[PDB]
Amino acid sequence: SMEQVAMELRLTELTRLLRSVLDQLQDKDPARIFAQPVSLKEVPDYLDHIKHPMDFATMRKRLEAQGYKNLHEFEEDFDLIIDNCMKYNARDTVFYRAAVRLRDQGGVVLRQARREVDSIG
Ligand code: NA
Numbered sequence: 001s002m003e004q005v006a007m008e009l010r011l012t013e014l015t016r017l018l019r020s021v022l023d024q025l026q027d028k029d030p031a032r033i034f035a036q037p038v039s040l041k042e043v044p045d046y047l048d049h050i051k052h053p054m055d056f057a058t059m060r061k062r063l064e065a066q067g068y069k070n071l072h073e074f075e076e077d078f079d080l081i082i083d084n085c086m087k088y089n090a091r092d093t094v095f096y097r098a099a100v101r102l103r104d105q106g107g108v109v110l111r112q113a114r115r116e117v118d119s120i121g
Pocket of ligand 1: 088
């Protein structure tokens with residue numbers, strides 16, 4: 001059907017907006033602390049602490065499969081990256097502090113994305 005292709009035109013265009021948003025969030029992490037999953041060989045207890053790991057490469061694979069049906073789903077994943085990191089690492093660490101900064105800088109980008117997704121549809 002034609003409707004399915006119009007929805008697909010919108011899921012596709014959402015993906016195009018989310019890709020720009022992802023690239024912009026990932027520029028606020030020049031250290032690349034959040035680029036790839038935490039290594040279970042280097043952190044073998046990780047899953048005893050964090051039940052849903054997330055990272056930017058994993059978000060990108062989902063994005064490129066058109067796996068985000070709305071901005072809420074995308075934001076949930078971004079907040080995992082931040083939230084996992086602030087739980088696992090102590091407050092006085094470079095990692096915990098990188099997450100705070102990412103969150104703060106990410107907020108501005110996400111605020112305007114919520115407007116563009118509402119505005120365009
Ligand atoms: Na903690």
